[PDB]
Design a protein around this ligand. Structure first.
Ligand SMILES: CCCCCCCCCCCCCCCCCC(=O)OC[C@H](COP(=O)([O-])OCC(O)COP(=O)([O-])OC[C@@H](COC(=O)CCCCCCCCCCCCCCCCC)OC(=O)CCCCCCCCCCCCCCCCC)OC(=O)CCCCCCCCCCCCCCCCC
Ligand SMILES: CCCCCCCCCCCCCCCCCC(=O)OC[C@H](COP(=O)([O-])OC[C@H](O)COP(=O)([O-])OC[C@H](COC(=O)CCCCCCCCCCCCCCCCC)OC(=O)CCCCCCCCCCCCCCCCC)OC(=O)CCCCCCCCCCCCCCCCC
Ligand SMILES: CCCCCCCCCCCCCCCCCC(=O)OC[C@H](COP(=O)([O-])OCC[N+](C)(C)C)OC(=O)CCCCCCCCCCCCCCCCC
Ligand SMILES: CCCCCCCCCCCCCCCCCC(=O)OC[C@H](COP(=O)([O-])OCC[N+](C)(C)C)OC(=O)CCCCCCCCCCCCCCCCC
Ligand SMILES: CCCCCCCCCCCCCCCCCC(=O)OC[C@H](COP(=O)([O-])OCC[N+](C)(C)C)OC(=O)CCCCCCCCCCCCCCCCC
Ligand SMILES: CCCCCCCCCCCCCCCCCC(=O)OC[C@H](COP(=O)([O-])OCC[N+](C)(C)C)OC(=O)CCCCCCCCCCCCCCCCC
Ligand SMILES: CCCCCCCCCCCCCCCCCC(=O)OC[C@H](COP(=O)(O)OCCN)OC(=O)CCCCCCCCCCCCCCCCC
Ligand SMILES: CCCCCCCCCCCCCCCCCC(=O)OC[C@H](COP(=O)(O)OCCN)OC(=O)CCCCCCCCCCCCCCCCC
Ligand SMILES: CCCCCCCCCCCCCCCCCC(=O)OC[C@H](COP(=O)(O)OCCN)OC(=O)CCCCCCCCCCCCCCCCC
Lengths: 311, 48, 347, 80, 175, 98, 171, 110
């Protein structure tokens, strides 16, 4: 009965990642004054299935790998860490209800750079290795402000429990007392997944075939949907009636779709940063403000007597 | 808003903790009889 | 190096040694050793040449291995005692591990194989710090755990340290490696008398630090790193010529100089405890140290003199170098023997 | 000290905002009246069991039942 | 079988270090140390040390072993390996890892049960749930006490981290 | 003594034997050293959680942080070696024989 | 060593309170109000004796007074209590804050039919004083006598006789 | 237990999708192709800046590891000491950042 619940989590994740490609191409279509896919299925609803069957029978490149084991374990780790970030997410009750789900997600996302690094070393190219090292440096850079912003917000929560984060926001959204943390969190999650305007990989895993590239691709989009849902729970937490959980489920679904389309609407609006310009954005703009707001959200529940409950 | 609601949640935490405190004598007496039951059973099966 | 950063780093070295000296807890002992190593690593790389990077790498590897063995000894103590007081250890396995780890931090033989290398790779002031200040923290931990130190192990390490620091001084023309093998021999001397009277351990430590600091201060005043470069001191500064060599006659262990003060007192505490063979052997090996270091004394005060013509230019310039405490440390390293019963202040 | 402040607010508003937020986070917990209530709520939160005392005979400040007058009361927390 | 699980992980943990103490390469050495960190974290998590296991993942593995793999990947110039079609490029990997789990299951033999059954821990070893603790992880509150009780510890730790930043920036300059 | 503690000590001694027999690289030395640090973390954590000794639960984190900072220092040393020779080979570190 | 004296199975038998935890949490504050005295005499015996074997009968007194707490709910107000603990029982964390109208009905029916006042916030966490006739334990750790300390130093400090007595130094 | 089953199912689905992604187009007998990028035979030069940002990540990540028990430390009784040490840790993280600033450590990846 629990394995049924694991399958009903992981199969709709893959279906939602499949149709996120359609939603991305349609929304980027209409924002670019054009249409997106509408020929393949009715209004394009068979374009993800056609793209998947195309990528999964495409020829493997016969890759001259510098290692077998890291070449295989980078998509495996990418998909496993793409799926295991979902299991503490409260929707309104998670698959794995754990007391440290926030810290669990921060740890499993900090482990997600090894897929990039092992894909980089598993290629023979020095240029692909340089691009992978740049991507790893970018991602571990923005994980710093992920951790500090996340800590600063959870100083209003009481604990690292994600289900408690629904109880915290029953009177007001947590974007009202923490909107600078919200906007820096949102740009930081934008810069984690190498999403535009932080996508200098399209400006490292091309040693793979088109199939394993589809695996890294769907792991990246599962991370995009997951960080949008986690931002929804973290700042725009919905109303929850324990006798009708579908109210919370429809509410955070609508907010997660709007935030994912906000990613799609940011990527069709801005040019890319140069690499040192987003290192400047992290280390010289987001990090002083983030440390000051960390001091502020430490010392503020003490001065307002609004220290949240531990339990 | 977070001020009023964190203060109310602290009052609710104190209410739950006082429920725990009112229940701890019964749970402690049942725990004592639990462990003495199991040790008497282990003693008798050790003797046989 | 930025001088404010130098002051901060030197105070951090002193702070790490002080945290090892004042703490009643094992985690703070380990923290003080970690702080001491972390801060002393740029002192070795003051000049930024490949020999300093090699020396700092060897020093990092040895001191990191000693730090992890120290933490394993602490963890085994927490198994068999459930507590953290810096006192005697409650397992001879943890006692053996902490004795081995402190012998690695001191560079006692057979863990001596990093001491003549690293001292060769680094400048003279950083070698001065490595051979004077870095002895103070592991000798303090050995002072605090001596009810658990195995007798046979500390005597084995002591006599092996004295023999290897003796036979290391033959084949050397480098002044820094000679100070390093003298370091190894004197650490064998200090840990010989540790389980019998640790006041003589502290006396040997203080006299050793005074003599080593006098020698490195003279080496910095003359900017000489080898025996052959030391041999030109008679023509440049003739007062510098003999002070090096009466200080080194002290460092051998030779009356009436104060470097005869530790070893004799060490023998004076080991013939009480019915060990006659062991101080006899250790001080015969100290005579072997006298043999090689007296050959160096003959090298500087006598035969191999000759100068070069550019020395004539150095006659028109005095030493503007800071010879800090060098008359004080030269007086305290020779003429202290008539004040030998001052050692009661070290109880 | 004022034209320099306008200059640094023109050039670098991020660092001005950071130092202002950090300065307020330092000074404002002492300038606040509600800071003592944080201390009072955290010391009145009962994580343990309130172990009773043997009645020796002369303890006027210690009650005999939770619904007694004497004892530490949280009327201030209920009202605020 | 399920009872001895911590012990099983510990055996794998020991075998994990034999993955890289024999030192086949620094890159496979990092890979073996990551797998060993995961299984030692499993050992930690199965005593109720949830925060400490997440410090293994977040700080040891995702914080420091990322930097070890990063610095290793900026050295040790690579070279290709066998890249025949799928009967070599993945089939040998699967047969090798099946032989690795064969080696894991292979050590639980008659020379092991003389140590396991004479010194049976499972049944009386894992005693972290001995009675009630209350409304709090004792390990969480012990880590929380770093700020009220650990004033000197936090001072010397933050000073060592500041000195670590200064020391790295001084030695990595070359001037 | 106990069994799982003997396993963590066995891992510590195995990574010690790997730390005491160098093959080619300095990164192998740093990896064996940090495997030693990992085993110290595991064994300290199991002792501290076993005895329910509460205040020592901050101790392994301390044992992490310093030592991880220590590893950072070691990595920087390796880098300077690899900026002089091009490799991190321990046989390039033999100029201090004389 | 000595044989540990475990009491018999017949000395442990009591009429248990066989209700679930949501029944106990819905009936927690009135239990803390009305069953105060044998509960606190038991927990005072439990923290003073540090041994459950000497805390048996007082514990049974708890299990004598808990059931008479619930029977007096079962005779008068079993239906508002059942409607209240069902809504307590629904929730995962068993929130008091989800069940306020059933709480008001249970408190109203209890204050009417029995006259019990639900305690204020802050009262059940009080340290109370307990009057007992049982004695104070003179050695609850069962410890033996401490070893005697070393004799301290005393008296006026005289100078050292003929100095240090170090081989030839006369001072 | 449920967590281990969930991790095992996620790992099995990942390995199954990788195995399908490798073995399904290797049914094809397409072509054995020959004749094997911005460098052809150049070695990798080391870059000091990437290592500086990696070690900067590691040191600030250790400072974050210290900062992590703050939502639990807010519940303590000695709030003045707790607030002083929390502000002291975040201030030392800021002092490490300012020293990384002024010694040109954040340059050419600022
Ligand atoms: C207690 C233990 C103290 C241990 C020593 C502490 C100082 C050493 C460490 C710091 C250091 O280097 O200081 C420099 C050091 C001198 O060493 P130097 O640089 O090698 O000397 C070169 C020339 O003397 C420099 O000459 P100049 O041309 O620059 O000008 C004259 C200069 C100018 O100095 C002044 O103006 C000093 C007065 C102002 C002080 C600051 C006021 C603010 O005077 C001196 O420096 C005269 C020498 C002073 C005596 C040095 C040794 C002191 C005794 C050490 C302990 C001996 C124990 C023996 C036990 C034997 C039996 C076991 O001390 C001073 O300059 C100040 C001396 C203060 C003495 C206080 C004594 C009582 C303490 C209680
Ligand atoms: C109304 C208010 C006013 C009242 C005023 C009353 C006082 C008025 C006079 C004021 C001045 C007083 C001066 C001190 C009192 C006399 C001390 C004395 O002679 O002790 C005898 C002392 C033992 O003889 P005693 O018959 O048993 O005692 C007669 C008294 O009752 C001795 O009594 P004690 O039982 O108290 O003896 C104490 C004890 C007695 O001794 C012992 O218990 C045995 C320990 C003795 C040292 C053994 C060390 C052996 C290994 C190291 C040798 C190093 C090389 C030797 C020197 C080479 C050149 C540097 O002394 C010690 O432990 C300290 C060490 C010896 C220092 C003596 C004082 C020297 C001050 C000036 C130093 C100038 C450099 C001298 C040479 C440096 C070495 C001494 O003689 C020796 O040990 C022979 C060594 C030389 C003694 C120094 C003579 C002092 C005058 C020297 C002026 C000329 C300097 C020339 C330039 C520099 C040298 C080339
Ligand atoms: C959670 C749901 C979503 C949340 C909101 C996010 C949705 C909106 C997204 C919009 C599109 C974003 C596109 C990509 C953005 C990347 C570029 C960018 O903006 O970089 C950040 C830019 C960078 O600026 P920059 O790059 O222009 O700066 C140039 C810097 N120099 C001069 C050094 C070269 O801005 C920031 O870093 C600001 C971050 C937010 C600051 C919030 C401060 C709050 C107020 C504090 C107090 C201030 C007053 C002082 C005290 C007063 C007391 C009374
Ligand atoms: C030959 C010169 C060195 C001999 C030194 C011995 C001085 C001494 O006190 O001897 C008594 C000690 C004996 O110590 P002991 O007095 O404790 O002997 C046992 C006690 N009785 C006698 C009561 C049974 O002699 C030795 O230790 C002799 C060996 C000296 C050291 C080795 C010398 C090797 C050659 C150089
Ligand atoms: C759920 C997500 C999507 C899942 C994947 C999509 C579902 C369908 C998967 C199977 C698709 C069909 C097989 C792969 C494509 C084969 C294309 C091809 O070139 O075939 C010719 C190949 C080879 O044809 P060939 O002999 O002419 O070789 C061509 C190459 N030369 C001439 C140079 C030698 O056919 C096969 O290898 C047979 C494959 C299996 C055929 C169907 C069996 C039943 C499958 C159920
Ligand atoms: C620079 C150092 C700044 C912080 C100094 C300590 C501030 C503090 O909270 O002190 C009170 C704290 C603790 O006092 P407290 O007020 O928490 O005491 C309550 C009692 N306990 C802790 C059991 C809850 O520290 C001390 O009183 C002594 C330790 C600090 C000693 C000075 C260290 C200087 C280091 C320089 C390098
Ligand atoms: C290259 C190899 C293959 C790569 C892909 C696969 C591996 C990498 C991706 C998956 C990572 C696995 C992470 C496993 C642990 C995650 C942390 C964790 O367990 O946290 C949850 C929870 C703590 O929360 P809490 O609520 O306190 O616990 C219940 C208390 N009432 O704690 C619990 O609930 C404890 C549950 C029991 C303990 C679980 C132990 C899992 C098995 C050991 C580790 C397995 C992975 C080893 C290799 C890792 C390589 C990175
Ligand atoms: C129970 C006892 C407890 C312990 C008691 C106390 C033990 C003290 C141990 C002292 C160890 C000191 C080590 C050296 C000092 C540390 C800092 C340092 O190295 O300063 C020297 C300084 C560096 O200048 P720099 O520019 O780097 O010179 C190199 C060329 N450019 O400048 C120079 O290089 C100038 C040259 C002269 C330097 C002389 C320094 C002597 C310091 C030691 C004095 C003697 C020991 C103290 C007194 C006796 C106590 C043992
Ligand atoms: C006491 C409270 C706690 C304080 C500690 C915690 C602070 C949290 C934020 C941490 C920030 C860490 C890094 C800070 C580095 C400061 C030095 C600096 O940045 O100098 C350079 C800069 C000139 O800019 P430039 O060099 O051109 O920048 C490169 C891109 N163009 O120079 C500048 O832009 C000038 C920056 C310094 C002066 C800023 C003054 C702000 C004043 C705000 C109002 C008063 C606030 C009260 C406290 C006083 C603060 C000074």
């Amino acid at each position: 009965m629990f394995m049924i619940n694991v399958l009903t989590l992981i199969i709709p994740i893959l279906l939602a990642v499949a149709f996120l490609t359609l939603v991305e191409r349609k929304v980027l279509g209409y924002m670019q004054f054009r249409k997106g896919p509408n020929v393949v299925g009715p209004y394009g609803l068979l374009q993800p299935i056609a793209d998947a069957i195309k990528l999964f029978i495409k020829e493997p490149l016969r890759p001259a790998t510098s290692s077998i084991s890291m070449f295989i374990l980078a998509p495996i780790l990418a998909l496993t860490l793409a799926l295991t970030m979902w299991i503490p997410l409260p929707m309104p009750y998670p698959l794995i209800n754990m007391n440290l789900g926030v810290l669990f997600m921060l740890a499993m996302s900090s482990l997600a750079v090894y897929s990039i690094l092992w894909s980089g070393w598993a290629s023979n190219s020095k240029y692909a290795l340089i691009g992978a090292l740049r991507a790893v440096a970018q991602t571990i850079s923005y994980e710093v402000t992920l951790a500090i912003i996340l800590l600063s917000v959870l100083l209003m929560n009481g604990s690292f429990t994600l289900s408690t984060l629904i109880i915290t926001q029953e009177q007001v959204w947590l974007i009202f007392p923490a909107w600078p943390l919200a906007m820096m969190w949102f740009i930081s999650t934008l810069a984690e997944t190498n999403r535009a305007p932080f996508d200098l990989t399209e400006g490292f895993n091309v040693e793979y075939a088109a199939g394993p590239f589809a695996l890294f691709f769907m792991a990246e989009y599962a991370n995009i949907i997951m960080m949008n849902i986690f931002t929804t729970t973290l700042f725009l937490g919905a109303f929850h009636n324990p006798y009708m959980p579908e109210l919370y489920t429809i509410n955070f679904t609508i907010k997660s779709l709007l935030l994912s389309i906000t990613f799609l609407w940011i990527r069709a609006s801005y040019p890319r940063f140069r690499y040192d310009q987003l290192m400047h954005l992290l280390w010289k703009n987001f990090l002083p403000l983030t440390l000051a707001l960390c001091m502020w959200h430490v010392s503020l529940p003490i001065l307002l007597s609004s220290i949240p409950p531990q339990t | 808003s977070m001020m009023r609601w964190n203060r109310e949640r602290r009052r609710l935490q104190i209410e739950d903790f006082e429920a725990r405190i009112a229940l701890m004598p019964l749970l402690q007496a049942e725990k004592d009889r639990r462990v003495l039951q199991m040790l008497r059973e282990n003693l008798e099966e050790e003797a046989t | 190096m930025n001088p404010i950063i130098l002051i901060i780093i030197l105070m951090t070295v002193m702070l790490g040694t002080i945290i090892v000296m004042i703490s009643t807890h094992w985690l703070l002992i380990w923290i003080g050793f970690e702080m001491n190593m972390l801060a002393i690593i740029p002192i070795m790389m003051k000049k930024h040449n490949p020999r300093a990077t090699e020396a700092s790498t060897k020093y990092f590897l040895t001191q990191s291995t000693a730090s992890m063995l120290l933490m394993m000894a602490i963890i085994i103590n927490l198994m068999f005692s459930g507590q953290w007081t810096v006192m005697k250890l409650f397992n001879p396995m943890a006692s053996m591990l902490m004795t081995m780890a402190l012998a690695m931090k001191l560079g006692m033989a057979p863990f001596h194989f990093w001491v003549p290398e690293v001292t060769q790779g680094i400048p003279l002031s950083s070698g001065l710090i490595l051979l004077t200040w870095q002895k103070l923290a592991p000798m303090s931990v050995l002072y605090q755990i001596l009810p658990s130190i195995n007798l046979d192990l500390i005597l084995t390490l002591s006599i092996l340290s004295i023999t290897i620091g003796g036979w290391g001084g033959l084949n050397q023309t480098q002044l820094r490696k000679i100070m390093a093998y003298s370091s190894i021999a004197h650490m064998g001397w200090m840990t010989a008398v540790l389980l019998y009277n640790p006041t003589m351990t502290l006396l040997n430590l203080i006299i050793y630090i005074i003599m080593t600091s006098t020698m490195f201060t003279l080496f910095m005043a003359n900017s000489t790193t080898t025996t052959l470069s030391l041999s030109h001191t008679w023509n440049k500064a003739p007062i510098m010529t003999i002070l090096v060599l009466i200080t080194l006659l002290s460092m051998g262990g030779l009356p009436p100089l104060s470097g005869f003060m530790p070893k004799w007192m060490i023998i004076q505490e080991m013939t009480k405890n019915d060990s006659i063979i062991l101080p006899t052997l250790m001080a015969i090996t100290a005579l072997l140290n006298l043999y090689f270091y007296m050959r160096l004394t003959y090298s500087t005060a006598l035969t191999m003199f000759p100068s070069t013509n550019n020395m004539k230019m150095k006659w028109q310039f005095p030493t503007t170098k800071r010879m800090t405490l060098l008359p004080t440390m030269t007086v305290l390293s020779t003429m202290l023997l008539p004040l030998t019963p001052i050692l009661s202040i070290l109880e | 000290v004022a034209a320099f402040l306008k200059n640094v607010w023109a050039k670098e508003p991020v660092l001005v905002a950071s130092f202002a937020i950090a300065g307020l986070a330092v000074i404002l917990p002492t300038l606040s009246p509600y800071t003592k209530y944080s201390l009072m709520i955290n010391r009145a939160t009962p994580y343990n069991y309130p172990v009773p005392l043997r009645d020796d005979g002369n303890m006027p400040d210690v009650p005999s039942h939770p619904q007694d007058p004497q004892g530490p009361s949280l009327e201030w927390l209920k009202r605020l | 079988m399920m009872t001895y699980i911590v012990f099983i992980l510990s055996i794998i943990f020991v075998m994990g270090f034999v993955g890289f103490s024999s030192k086949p390469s620094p890159i496979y050495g990092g890979l073996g140390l990551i797998v060993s960190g995961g299984v030692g974290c499993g050992i930690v998590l199965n005593f109720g040390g949830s925060f400490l296991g997440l410090m293994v993942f977040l700080i040891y593995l995702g914080g420091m072993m990322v930097v070890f793999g990063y610095t290793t990947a900026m050295a040790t110039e690579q070279y290709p390996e066998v890249w025949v079609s799928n009967k070599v490029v993945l089939g040998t990997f699967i047969t090798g890892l099946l032989m690795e789990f064969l080696m894991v299951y292979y050590v639980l033999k008659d020379k092991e049960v003389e140590i396991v059954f004479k010194f049976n821990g499972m049944g009386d070893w894992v005693i972290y749930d001995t009675g009630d603790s209350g409304f709090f992880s004792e390990e969480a509150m012990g880590i929380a006490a770093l700020y009220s009780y650990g004033t000197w510890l936090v001072i010397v730790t933050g000073w060592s981290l500041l000195i670590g930043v200064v020391v790295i920036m001084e030695i990595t300059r070359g001037n | 003594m106990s069994l799982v503690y003997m396993n963590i000590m066995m891992a510590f001694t195995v990574s010690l034997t790997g730390l005491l027999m160098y093959r080619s690289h300095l990164m192998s030395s740093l990896l064996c050293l940090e495997g030693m640090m990992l085993s110290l973390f595991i064994l300290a954590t199991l002792m501290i959680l076993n005895s329910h000794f509460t205040l020592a639960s901050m101790m392994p984190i301390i044992l992490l942080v310093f030592a991880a900072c220590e590893a950072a220092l070691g990595l920087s040393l390796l880098v300077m070696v690899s900026n002089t020779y091009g490799t991190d080979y321990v046989q390039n570190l033999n100029l201090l024989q004389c | 060593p000595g044989i540990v004296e475990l009491p018999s199975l017949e000395d442990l038998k009591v009429q248990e309170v066989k209700v679930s935890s949501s029944v106990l949490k819905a009936a927690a504050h009135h239990y803390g109000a009305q069953c105060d005295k044998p509960n606190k005499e038991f927990m005072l015996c439990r923290w003073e004796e540090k041994d459950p074997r000497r805390c048996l009968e007082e514990g049974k007194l708890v299990n004598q007074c808990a059931l008479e707490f619930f029977r007096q709910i079962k005779r008068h107000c079993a239906e508002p209590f059942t409607e209240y603990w069902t809504c307590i029982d629904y929730s995962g964390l068993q929130l008091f804050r989800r069940c306020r109208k059933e709480q008001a009905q249970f408190d109203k029916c209890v204050l009417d039919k029995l006259g019990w006042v639900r305690p204020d916030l802050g009262e059940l966490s009080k340290v109370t004083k307990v009057k007992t006739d049982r004695p104070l334990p003179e050695n609850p750790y069962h410890s033996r006598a401490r070893p005697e300390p070393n004799p301290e130093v005393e008296g006026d400090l005289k100078p050292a006789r003929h100095g240090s007595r170090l081989f030839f130094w006369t001072m | 237990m449920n967590l281990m089953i969930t991790l095992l199912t996620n790992f099995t689905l990942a390995t199954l999708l990788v195995t399908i992604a490798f073995w399904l187009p290797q049914l094809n007998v397409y072509s054995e192709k020959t004749s094997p990028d911005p460098m052809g035979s150049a070695r990798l030069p080391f870059s000091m800046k990437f290592f500086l940002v990696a070690i900067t990540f590691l040191l600030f990540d250790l400072e974050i590891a210290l900062l992590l028990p703050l939502p639990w430390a807010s519940q303590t009784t000695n709030l003045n000491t707790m607030l002083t040490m929390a502000l002291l840790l975040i201030f030392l993280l800021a002092v490490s950042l300012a020293y990384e600033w002024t010694q040109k450590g954040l340059e050419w990846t600022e």
